[PDB]
mmCIF file of C-alpha atoms in Angstrom:
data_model
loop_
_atom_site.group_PDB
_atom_site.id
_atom_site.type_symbol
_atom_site.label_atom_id
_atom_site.label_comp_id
_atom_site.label_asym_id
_atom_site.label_seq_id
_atom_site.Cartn_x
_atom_site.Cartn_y
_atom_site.Cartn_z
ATOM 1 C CA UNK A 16 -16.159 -34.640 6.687
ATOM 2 C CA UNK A 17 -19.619 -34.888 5.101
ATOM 3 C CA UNK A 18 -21.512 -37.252 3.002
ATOM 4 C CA UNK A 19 -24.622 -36.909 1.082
ATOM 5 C CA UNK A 20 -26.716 -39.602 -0.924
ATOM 6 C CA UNK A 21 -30.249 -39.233 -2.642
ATOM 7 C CA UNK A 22 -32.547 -42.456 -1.369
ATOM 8 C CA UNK A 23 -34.813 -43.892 -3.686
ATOM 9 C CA UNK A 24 -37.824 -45.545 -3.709
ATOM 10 C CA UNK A 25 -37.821 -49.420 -4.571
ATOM 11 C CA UNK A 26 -41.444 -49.181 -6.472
ATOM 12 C CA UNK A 27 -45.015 -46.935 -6.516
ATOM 13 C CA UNK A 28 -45.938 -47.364 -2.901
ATOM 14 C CA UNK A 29 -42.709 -46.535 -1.045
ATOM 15 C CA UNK A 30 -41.983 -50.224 0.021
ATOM 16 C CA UNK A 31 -38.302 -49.003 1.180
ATOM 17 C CA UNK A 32 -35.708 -46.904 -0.357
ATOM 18 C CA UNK A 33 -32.645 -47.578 -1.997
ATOM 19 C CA UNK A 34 -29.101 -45.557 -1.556
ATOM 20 C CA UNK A 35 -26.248 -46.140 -3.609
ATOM 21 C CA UNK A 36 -23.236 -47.478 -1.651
ATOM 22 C CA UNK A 37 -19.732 -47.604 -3.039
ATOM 23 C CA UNK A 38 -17.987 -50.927 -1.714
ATOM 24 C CA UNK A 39 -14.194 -51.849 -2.584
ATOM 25 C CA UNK A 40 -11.201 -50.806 -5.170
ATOM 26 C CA UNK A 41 -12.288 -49.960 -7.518
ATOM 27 C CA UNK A 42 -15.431 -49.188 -6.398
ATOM 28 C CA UNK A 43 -18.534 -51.957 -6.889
ATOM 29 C CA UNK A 44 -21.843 -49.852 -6.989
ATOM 30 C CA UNK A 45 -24.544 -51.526 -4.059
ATOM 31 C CA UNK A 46 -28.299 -50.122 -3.755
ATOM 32 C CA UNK A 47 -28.736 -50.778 0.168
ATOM 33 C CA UNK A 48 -32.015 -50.848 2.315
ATOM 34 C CA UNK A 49 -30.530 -48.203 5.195
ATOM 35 C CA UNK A 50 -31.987 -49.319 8.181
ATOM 36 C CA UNK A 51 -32.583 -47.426 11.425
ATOM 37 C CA UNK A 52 -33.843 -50.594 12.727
ATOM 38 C CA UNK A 53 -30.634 -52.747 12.432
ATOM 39 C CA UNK A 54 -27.207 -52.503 12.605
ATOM 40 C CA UNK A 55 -25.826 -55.088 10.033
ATOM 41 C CA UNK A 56 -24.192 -54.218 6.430
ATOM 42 C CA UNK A 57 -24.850 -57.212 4.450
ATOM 43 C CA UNK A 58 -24.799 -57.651 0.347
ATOM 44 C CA UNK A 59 -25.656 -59.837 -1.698
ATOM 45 C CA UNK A 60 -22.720 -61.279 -3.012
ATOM 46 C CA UNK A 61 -20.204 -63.459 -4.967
ATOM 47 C CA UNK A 62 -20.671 -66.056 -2.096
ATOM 48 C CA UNK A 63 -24.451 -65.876 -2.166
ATOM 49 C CA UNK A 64 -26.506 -69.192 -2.900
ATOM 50 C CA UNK A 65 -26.780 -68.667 -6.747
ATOM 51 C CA UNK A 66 -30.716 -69.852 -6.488
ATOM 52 C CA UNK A 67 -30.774 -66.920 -4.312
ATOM 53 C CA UNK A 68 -29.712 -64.485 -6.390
ATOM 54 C CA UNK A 69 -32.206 -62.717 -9.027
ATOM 55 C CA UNK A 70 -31.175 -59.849 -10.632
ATOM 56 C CA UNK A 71 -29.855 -58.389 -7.737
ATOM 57 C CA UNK A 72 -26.280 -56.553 -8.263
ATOM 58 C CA UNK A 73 -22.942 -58.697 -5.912
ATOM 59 C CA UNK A 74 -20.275 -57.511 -4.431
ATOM 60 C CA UNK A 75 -17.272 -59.548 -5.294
ATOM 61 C CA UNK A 76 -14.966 -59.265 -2.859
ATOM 62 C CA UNK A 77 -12.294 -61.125 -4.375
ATOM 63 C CA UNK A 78 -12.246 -58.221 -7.248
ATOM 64 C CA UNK A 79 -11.493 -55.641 -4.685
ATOM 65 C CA UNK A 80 -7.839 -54.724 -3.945
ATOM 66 C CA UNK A 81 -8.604 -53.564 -0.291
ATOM 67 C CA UNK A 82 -10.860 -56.518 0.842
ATOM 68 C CA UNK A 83 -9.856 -58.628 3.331
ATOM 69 C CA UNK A 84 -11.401 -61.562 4.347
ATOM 70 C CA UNK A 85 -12.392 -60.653 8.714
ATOM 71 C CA UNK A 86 -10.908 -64.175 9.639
ATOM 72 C CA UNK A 87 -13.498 -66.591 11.425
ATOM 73 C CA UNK A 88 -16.431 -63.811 11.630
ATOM 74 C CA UNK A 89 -19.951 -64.720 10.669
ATOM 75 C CA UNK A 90 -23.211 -63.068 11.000
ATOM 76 C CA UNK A 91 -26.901 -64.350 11.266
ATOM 77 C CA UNK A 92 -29.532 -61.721 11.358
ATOM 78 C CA UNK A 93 -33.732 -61.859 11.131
ATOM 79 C CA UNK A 94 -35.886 -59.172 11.009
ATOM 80 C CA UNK A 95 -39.520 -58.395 12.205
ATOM 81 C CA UNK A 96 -41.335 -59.158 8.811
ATOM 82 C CA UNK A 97 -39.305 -62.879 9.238
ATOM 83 C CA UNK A 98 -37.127 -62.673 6.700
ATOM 84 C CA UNK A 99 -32.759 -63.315 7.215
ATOM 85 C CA UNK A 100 -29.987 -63.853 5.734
ATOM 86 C CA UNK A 101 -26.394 -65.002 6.693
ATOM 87 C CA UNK A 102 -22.850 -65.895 5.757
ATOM 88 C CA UNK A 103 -19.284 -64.409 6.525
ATOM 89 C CA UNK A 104 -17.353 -60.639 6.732
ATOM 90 C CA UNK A 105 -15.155 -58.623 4.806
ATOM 91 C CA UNK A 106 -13.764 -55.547 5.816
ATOM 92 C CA UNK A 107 -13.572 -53.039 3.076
ATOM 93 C CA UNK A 108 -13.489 -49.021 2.046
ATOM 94 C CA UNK A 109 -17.060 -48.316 1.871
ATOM 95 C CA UNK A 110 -18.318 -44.248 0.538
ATOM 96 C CA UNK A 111 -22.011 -42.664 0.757
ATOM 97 C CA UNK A 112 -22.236 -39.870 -0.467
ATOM 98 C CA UNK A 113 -18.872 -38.659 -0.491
ATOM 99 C CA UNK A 114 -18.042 -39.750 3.035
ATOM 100 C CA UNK A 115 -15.495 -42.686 3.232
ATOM 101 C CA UNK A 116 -14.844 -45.311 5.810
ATOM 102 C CA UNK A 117 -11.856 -47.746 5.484
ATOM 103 C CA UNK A 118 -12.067 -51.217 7.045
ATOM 104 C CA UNK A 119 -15.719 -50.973 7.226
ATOM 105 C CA UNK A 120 -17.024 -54.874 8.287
ATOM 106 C CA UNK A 121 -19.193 -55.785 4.897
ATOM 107 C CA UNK A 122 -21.167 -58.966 5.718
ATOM 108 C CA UNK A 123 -21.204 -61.169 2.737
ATOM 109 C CA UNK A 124 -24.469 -63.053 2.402
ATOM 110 C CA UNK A 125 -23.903 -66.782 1.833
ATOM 111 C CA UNK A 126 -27.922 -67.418 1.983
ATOM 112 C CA UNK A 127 -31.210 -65.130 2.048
ATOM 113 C CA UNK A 128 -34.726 -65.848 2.462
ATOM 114 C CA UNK A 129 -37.167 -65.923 -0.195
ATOM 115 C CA UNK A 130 -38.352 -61.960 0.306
ATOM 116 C CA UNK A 131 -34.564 -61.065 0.080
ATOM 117 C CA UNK A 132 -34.372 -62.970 -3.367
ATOM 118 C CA UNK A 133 -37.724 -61.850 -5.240
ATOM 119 C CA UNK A 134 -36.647 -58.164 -4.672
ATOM 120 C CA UNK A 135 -34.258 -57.527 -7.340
ATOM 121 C CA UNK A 136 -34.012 -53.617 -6.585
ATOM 122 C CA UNK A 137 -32.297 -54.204 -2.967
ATOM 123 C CA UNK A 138 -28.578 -55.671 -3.257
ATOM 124 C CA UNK A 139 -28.135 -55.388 0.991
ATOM 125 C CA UNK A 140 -29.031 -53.411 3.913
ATOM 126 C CA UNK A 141 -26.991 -50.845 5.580
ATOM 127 C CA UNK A 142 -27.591 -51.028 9.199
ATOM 128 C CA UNK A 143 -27.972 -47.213 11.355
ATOM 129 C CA UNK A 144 -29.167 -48.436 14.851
ATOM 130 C CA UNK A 145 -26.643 -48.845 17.012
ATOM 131 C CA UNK A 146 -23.720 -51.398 16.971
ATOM 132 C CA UNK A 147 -24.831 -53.121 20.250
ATOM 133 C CA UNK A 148 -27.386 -55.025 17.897
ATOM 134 C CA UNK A 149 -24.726 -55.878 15.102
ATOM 135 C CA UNK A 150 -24.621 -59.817 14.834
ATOM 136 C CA UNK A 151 -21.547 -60.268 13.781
ATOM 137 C CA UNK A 152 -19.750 -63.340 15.735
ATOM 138 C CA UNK A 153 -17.251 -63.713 18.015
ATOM 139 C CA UNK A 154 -15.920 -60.447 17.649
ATOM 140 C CA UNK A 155 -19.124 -57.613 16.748
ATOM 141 C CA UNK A 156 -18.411 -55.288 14.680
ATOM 142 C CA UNK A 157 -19.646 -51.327 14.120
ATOM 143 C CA UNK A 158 -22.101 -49.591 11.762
ATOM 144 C CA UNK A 159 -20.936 -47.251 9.152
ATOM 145 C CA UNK A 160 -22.263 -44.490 11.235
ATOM 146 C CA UNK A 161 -20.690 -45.533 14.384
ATOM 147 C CA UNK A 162 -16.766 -45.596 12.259
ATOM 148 C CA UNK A 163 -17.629 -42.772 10.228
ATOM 149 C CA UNK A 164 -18.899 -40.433 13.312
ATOM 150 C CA UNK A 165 -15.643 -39.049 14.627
ATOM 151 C CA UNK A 166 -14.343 -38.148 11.482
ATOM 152 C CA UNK A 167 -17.833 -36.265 10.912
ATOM 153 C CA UNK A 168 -18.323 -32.427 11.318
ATOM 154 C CA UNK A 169 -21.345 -33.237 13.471
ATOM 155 C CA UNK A 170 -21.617 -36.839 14.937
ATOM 156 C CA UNK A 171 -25.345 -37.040 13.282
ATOM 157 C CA UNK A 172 -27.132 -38.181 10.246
ATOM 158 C CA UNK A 173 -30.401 -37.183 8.577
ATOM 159 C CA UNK A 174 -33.304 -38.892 6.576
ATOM 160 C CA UNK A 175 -35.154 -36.871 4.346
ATOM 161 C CA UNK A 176 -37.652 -39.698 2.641
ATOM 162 C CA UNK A 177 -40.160 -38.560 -0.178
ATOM 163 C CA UNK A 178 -43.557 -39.437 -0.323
ATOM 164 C CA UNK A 179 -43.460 -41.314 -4.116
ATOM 165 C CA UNK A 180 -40.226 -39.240 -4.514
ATOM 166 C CA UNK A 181 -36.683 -38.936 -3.778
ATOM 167 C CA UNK A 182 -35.162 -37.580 -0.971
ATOM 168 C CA UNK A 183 -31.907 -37.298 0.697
ATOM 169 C CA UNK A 184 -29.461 -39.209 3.515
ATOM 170 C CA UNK A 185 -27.176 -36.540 5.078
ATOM 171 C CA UNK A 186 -24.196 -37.348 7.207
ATOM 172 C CA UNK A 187 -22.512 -35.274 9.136
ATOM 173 C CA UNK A 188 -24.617 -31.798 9.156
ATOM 174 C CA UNK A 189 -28.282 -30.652 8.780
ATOM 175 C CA UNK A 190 -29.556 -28.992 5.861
ATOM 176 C CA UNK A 191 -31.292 -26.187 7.258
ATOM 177 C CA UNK A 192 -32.230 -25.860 3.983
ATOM 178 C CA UNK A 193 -34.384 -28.855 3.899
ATOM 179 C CA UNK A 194 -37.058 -28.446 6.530
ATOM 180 C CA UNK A 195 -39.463 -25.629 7.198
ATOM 181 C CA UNK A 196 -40.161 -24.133 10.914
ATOM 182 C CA UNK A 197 -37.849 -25.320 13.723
ATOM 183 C CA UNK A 198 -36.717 -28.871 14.619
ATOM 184 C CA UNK A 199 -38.071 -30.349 18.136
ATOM 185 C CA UNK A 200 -35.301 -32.686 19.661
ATOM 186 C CA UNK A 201 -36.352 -35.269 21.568
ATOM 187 C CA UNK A 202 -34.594 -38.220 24.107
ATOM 188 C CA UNK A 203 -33.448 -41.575 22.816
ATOM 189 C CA UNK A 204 -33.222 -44.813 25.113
ATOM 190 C CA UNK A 205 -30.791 -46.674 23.359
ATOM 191 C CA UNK A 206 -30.997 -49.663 26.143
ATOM 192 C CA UNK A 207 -33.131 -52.268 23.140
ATOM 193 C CA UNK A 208 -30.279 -50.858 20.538
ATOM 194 C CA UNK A 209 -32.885 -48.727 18.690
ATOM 195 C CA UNK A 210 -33.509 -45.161 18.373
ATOM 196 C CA UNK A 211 -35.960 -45.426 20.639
ATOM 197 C CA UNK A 212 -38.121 -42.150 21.377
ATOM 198 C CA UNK A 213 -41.346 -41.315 23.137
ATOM 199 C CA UNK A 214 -44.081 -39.784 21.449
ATOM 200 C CA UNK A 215 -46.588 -37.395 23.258
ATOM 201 C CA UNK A 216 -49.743 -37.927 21.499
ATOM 202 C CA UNK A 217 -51.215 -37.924 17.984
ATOM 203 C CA UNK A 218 -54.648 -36.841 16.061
ATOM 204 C CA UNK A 219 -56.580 -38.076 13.752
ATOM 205 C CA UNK A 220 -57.587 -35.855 11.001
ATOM 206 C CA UNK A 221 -59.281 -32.485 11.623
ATOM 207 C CA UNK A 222 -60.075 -34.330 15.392
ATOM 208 C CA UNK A 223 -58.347 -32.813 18.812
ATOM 209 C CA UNK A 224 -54.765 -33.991 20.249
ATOM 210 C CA UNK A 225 -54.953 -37.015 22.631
ATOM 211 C CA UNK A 226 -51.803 -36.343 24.923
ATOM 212 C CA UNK A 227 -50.622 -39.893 25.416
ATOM 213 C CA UNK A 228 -46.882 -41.516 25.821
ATOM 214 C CA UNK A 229 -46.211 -43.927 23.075
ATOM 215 C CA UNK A 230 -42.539 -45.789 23.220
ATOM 216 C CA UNK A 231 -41.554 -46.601 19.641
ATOM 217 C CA UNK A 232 -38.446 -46.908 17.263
ATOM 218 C CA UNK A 233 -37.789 -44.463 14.415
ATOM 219 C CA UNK A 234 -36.908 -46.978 12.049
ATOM 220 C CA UNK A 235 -36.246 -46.254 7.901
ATOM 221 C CA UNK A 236 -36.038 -50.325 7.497
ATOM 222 C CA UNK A 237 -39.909 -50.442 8.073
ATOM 223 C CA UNK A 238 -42.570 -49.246 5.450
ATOM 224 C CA UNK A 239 -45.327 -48.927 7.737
ATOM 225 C CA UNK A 240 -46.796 -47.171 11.123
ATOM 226 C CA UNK A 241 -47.232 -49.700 13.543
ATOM 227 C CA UNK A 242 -49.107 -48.000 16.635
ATOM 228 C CA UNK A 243 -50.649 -49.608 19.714
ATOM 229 C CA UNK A 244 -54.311 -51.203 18.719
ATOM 230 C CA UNK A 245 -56.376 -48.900 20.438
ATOM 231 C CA UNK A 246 -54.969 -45.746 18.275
ATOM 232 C CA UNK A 247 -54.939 -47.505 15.282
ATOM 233 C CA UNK A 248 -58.650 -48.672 16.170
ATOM 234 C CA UNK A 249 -59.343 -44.952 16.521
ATOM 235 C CA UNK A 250 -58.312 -44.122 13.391
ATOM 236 C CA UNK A 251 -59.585 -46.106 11.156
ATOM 237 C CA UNK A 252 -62.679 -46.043 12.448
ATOM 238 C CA UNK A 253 -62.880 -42.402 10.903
ATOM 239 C CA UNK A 254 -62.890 -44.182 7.537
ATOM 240 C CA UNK A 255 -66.479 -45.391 6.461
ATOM 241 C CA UNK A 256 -65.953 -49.584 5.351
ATOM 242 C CA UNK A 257 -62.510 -49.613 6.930
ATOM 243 C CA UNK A 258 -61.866 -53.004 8.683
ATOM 244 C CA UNK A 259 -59.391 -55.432 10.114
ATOM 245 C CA UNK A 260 -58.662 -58.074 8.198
ATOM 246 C CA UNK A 261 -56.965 -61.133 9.492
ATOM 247 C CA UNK A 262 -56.878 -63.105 5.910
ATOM 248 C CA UNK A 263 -55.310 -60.372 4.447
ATOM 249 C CA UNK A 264 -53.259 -59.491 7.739
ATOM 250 C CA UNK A 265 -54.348 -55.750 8.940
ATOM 251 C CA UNK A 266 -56.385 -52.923 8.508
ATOM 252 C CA UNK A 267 -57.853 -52.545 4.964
ATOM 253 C CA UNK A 268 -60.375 -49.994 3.400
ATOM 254 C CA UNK A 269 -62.526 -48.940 0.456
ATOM 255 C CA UNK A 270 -60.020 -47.841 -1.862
ATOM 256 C CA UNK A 271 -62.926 -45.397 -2.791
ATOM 257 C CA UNK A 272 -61.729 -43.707 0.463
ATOM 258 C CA UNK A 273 -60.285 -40.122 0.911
ATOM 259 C CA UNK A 274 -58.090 -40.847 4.142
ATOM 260 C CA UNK A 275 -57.979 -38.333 7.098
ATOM 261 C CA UNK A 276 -54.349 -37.309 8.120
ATOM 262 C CA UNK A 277 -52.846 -38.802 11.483
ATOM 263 C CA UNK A 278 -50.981 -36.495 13.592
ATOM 264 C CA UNK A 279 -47.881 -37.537 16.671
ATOM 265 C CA UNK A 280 -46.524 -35.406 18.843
ATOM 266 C CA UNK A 281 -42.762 -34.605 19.138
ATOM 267 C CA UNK A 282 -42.371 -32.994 22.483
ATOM 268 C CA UNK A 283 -44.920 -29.824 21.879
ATOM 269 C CA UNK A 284 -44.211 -30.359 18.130
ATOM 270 C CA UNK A 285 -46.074 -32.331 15.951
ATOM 271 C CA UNK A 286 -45.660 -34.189 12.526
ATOM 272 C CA UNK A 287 -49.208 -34.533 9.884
ATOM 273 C CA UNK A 288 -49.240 -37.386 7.652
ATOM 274 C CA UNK A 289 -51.576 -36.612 4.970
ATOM 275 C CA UNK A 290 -53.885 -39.133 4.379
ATOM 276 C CA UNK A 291 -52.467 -39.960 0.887
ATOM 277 C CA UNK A 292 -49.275 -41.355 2.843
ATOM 278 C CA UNK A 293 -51.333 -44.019 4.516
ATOM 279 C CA UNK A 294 -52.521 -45.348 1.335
ATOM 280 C CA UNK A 295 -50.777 -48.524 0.499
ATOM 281 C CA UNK A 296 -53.120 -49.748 -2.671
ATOM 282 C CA UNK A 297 -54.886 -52.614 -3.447
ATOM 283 C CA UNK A 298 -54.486 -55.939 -1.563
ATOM 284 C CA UNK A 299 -54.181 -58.134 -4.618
ATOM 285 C CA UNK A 300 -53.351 -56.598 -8.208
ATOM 286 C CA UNK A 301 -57.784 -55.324 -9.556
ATOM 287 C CA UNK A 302 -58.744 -55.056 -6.112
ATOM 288 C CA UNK A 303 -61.080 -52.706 -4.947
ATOM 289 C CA UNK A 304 -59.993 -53.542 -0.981
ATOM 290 C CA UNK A 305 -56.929 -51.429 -0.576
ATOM 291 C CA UNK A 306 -54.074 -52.048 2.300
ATOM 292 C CA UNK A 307 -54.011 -49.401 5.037
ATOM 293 C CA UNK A 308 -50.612 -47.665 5.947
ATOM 294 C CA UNK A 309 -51.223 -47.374 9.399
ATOM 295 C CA UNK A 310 -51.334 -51.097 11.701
ATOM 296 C CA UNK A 311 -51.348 -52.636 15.054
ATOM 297 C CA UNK A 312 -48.182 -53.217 17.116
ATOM 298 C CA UNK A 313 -50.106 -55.404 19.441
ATOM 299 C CA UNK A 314 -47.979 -58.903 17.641
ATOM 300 C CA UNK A 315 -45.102 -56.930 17.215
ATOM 301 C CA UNK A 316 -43.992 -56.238 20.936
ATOM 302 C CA UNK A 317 -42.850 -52.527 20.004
ATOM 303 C CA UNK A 318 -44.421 -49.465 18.485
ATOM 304 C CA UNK A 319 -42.399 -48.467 14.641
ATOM 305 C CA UNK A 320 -42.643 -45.219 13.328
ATOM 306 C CA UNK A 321 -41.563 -46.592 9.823
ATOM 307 C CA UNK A 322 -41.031 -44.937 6.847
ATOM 308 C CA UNK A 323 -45.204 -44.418 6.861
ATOM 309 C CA UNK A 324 -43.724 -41.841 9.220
ATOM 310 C CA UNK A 325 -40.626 -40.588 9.313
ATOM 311 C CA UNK A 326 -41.632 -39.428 5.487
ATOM 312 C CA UNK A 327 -43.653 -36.976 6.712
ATOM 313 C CA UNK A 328 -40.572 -34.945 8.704
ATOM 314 C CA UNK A 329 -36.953 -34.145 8.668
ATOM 315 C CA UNK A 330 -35.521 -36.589 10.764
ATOM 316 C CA UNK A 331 -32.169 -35.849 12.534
ATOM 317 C CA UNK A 332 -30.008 -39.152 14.315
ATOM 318 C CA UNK A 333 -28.247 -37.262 16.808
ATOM 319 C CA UNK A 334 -25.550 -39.806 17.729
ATOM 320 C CA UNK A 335 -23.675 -37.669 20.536
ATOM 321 C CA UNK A 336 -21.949 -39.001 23.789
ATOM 322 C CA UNK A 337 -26.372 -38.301 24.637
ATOM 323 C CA UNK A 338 -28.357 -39.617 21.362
ATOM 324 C CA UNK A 339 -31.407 -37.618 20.885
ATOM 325 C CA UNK A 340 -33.820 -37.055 18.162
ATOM 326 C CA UNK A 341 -35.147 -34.303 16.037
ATOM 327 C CA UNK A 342 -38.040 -33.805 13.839
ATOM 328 C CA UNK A 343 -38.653 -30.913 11.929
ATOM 329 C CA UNK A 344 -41.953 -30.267 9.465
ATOM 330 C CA UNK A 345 -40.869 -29.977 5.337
#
């Protein structure tokens, strides 16, 4: 089997992406956050704190013939930017794109935090990483990737993000169609739970290749390049008024700028994100201080190619007995 989804951006600046996800009988219509970064499927749901809930679309379980209530389970999950939710588990028939997976675990929010609430275009997230990470309690449960994969053609999926566009989730083959040139594979740790990948160097702008390992996570679920200080000090220091601010919380610049492009390496491959990617607008809404795309790691405690990114390339998630990685140029 295959599936196939478009993924759409949430708003202007490419905050995240939303996929349609078919949940239950008859099928209840979720836009989830899918998130190489996590391994969770939670929505927003009948169950959800109603204070919580603004304008977001719920899954009802008790409206769907093949729900069934996964008997003492609970999850808890926070993410990097500090937000979480929690609350109990369904299991359910749950389609992208085509594909379907019976007795998928759906984790029904009973409470979100305030970021989860005052974004009305994201009803849940749909976990990719792997299920090691899943948070479901006492008994963890699997990602949608990890129950649809031997049913798959190909035990892989594929992000295709747009820059202020569409573009496309693939499961289960690669549209050769859909990237130019060849694609460079590359190895995956999975020993954090992450797709977790070693890049051998990057450039900044029309400047030469520094060969240099840097560990990081190809993760959808983040919006932004987070890269250790001294290569994000590099590049922004190619952009005349560009400065770190810690009121505002990173790198900004003259939104007067033209940004250079930033270049990483994929084995001997290597991705260019034009400078219009890294633009992120202005801080506050009139502001001529605008937010840069590309930030420190050095709080974080890992390096995130985020959707900053993984936009700029074909992505493959090869999830065989060996994960690797692939990126391809488009």
């Amino acid at each position: 089997s295959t599936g196939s989804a478009t993924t759409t951006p949430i708003d202007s600046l490419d905050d995240a992406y939303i996929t349609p996800v078919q949940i239950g009988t008859p099928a209840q219509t979720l836009n989830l956050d899918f998130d190489t970064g996590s391994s969770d499927l939670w929505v927003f749901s009948s169950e959800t704190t109603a204070s919580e809930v603004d304008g977001q679309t719920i899954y009802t379980p008790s409206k769907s013939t093949t729900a069934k209530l996964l008997s003492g389970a609970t999850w808890s999950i926070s993410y990097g930017d500090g937000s979480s939710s929690s609350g109990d588990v369904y299991t359910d028939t749950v389609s992208v794109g085509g594909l379907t997976v019976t007795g998928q675990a759906v984790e029904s929010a009973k409470k979100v935090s305030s970021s989860f609430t005052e974004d009305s275009t994201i009803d849940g997230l749909l976990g990719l990483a792997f299920s090691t990470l899943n948070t479901v309690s006492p008994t963890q449960q699997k990602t949608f990737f990890d129950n649809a994969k031997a049913s798959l053609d190909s035990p892989v999926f594929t992000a295709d993000l747009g820059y202020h566009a569409p573009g496309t989730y693939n499961f289960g083959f690669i549209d050769t169609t859909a990237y130019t040139g060849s694609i460079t594979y590359t190895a995956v740790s999975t020993k954090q739970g992450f797709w977790e990948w070693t890049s051998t160097g990057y450039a900044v702008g029309s400047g030469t290749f520094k060969s240099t390992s840097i560990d990081g996570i190809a993760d959808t679920g983040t919006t932004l390049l987070y890269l250790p200080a001294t290569v994000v000090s590099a590049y922004w220091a190619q952009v005349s008024g560009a400065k770190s601010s810690s009121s505002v919380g990173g790198y900004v610049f003259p939104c007067s700028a033209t940004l250079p492009s930033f270049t990483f390496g994929v084995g001997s491959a290597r991705i260019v994100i034009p400078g219009d990617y890294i633009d992120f607008g202005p801080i506050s809404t009139g502001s001529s201080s605008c937010f840069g795309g590309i930030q420190s790691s050095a709080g974080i405690g890992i390096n995130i190619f985020g959707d900053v990114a993984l936009k700029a390339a074909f992505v493959v998630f090869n999830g065989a007995t060996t994960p690797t990685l692939g990126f391809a140029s488009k």
